[PDB]
């Protein structure tokens, strides 16, 4: 599994469950084409998004929408979207893990490249 995504909720302190996450790859003319997508499991992770064969170097974007989310402590009209754009490079390690921590008016994201 070359690309994994982990989503956490910063106000409830739990995994972000049943959250839709989309992954796009940049096209030649600079369009974003759909690459892979799914919904986070009960541990806030999303596995089997792609395979080693399909995941080649290029520019990818991981998008997470927090609109539906939060009827928890803080709802807001902000409608924040996490947008993580990065370049997959065959030079560094093989496996990537993208983590996103969500709040109503903020979000942080990190990348852990192992193996």
Binding interface with a copy of itself (CB under 8 A): 8-15, 43, 59, 61, 73-87, 90-91, 93, 99, 101, 103-114
Minimum separation from the CB atom of position 22 to a copy of itself (A) = 13
Gaps (C–N > 2.5 Å) in the chain: which residues precede them? none
CB 66 within 8 A of CB 102: yes
Nearer to a copy of itself, 3 or 82 (CB): 82
CB 38 within 8 A of CB 49: yes
For residue 100, the Cα-to-chain-centroid distance in whole angstroms is 7
Minimum separation from the CB atom of position 88 to a copy of itself (A) = 9
Pairing of strands 106-114, 95-103: antiparallel
Residue 6 annotated as lining a ligand binding site = yes
Minimum separation from the CB atom of position 95 to a copy of itself (A) = 11
Can you say which residues are annotated as belonging to the binding site for L-thyroxine? Answer: 6, 45, 108
């Amino acid at each position: 599994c070359p690309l994994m995504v982990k989503v956490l909720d910063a106000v409830r302190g739990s995994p972000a469950i049943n959250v839709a996450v989309h992954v796009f790859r940049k096209a030649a003319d600079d369009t974003w084409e759909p690459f892979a997508s799914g919904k986070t499991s009960e541990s806030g992770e999303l596995h089997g998004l792609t395979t080693e064969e399909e995941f080649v170097e290029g520019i990818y974007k991981v998008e997470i929408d927090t609109k539906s989310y939060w009827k928890a402590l803080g709802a807001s009209p902000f409608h924040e979207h996490a947008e993580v754009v990065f370049t997959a490079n065959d030079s560094g390690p093989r496996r990537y893990t993208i983590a996103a921590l969500l709040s109503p008016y903020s979000y942080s994201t990190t990348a852990v490249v192992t193996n």
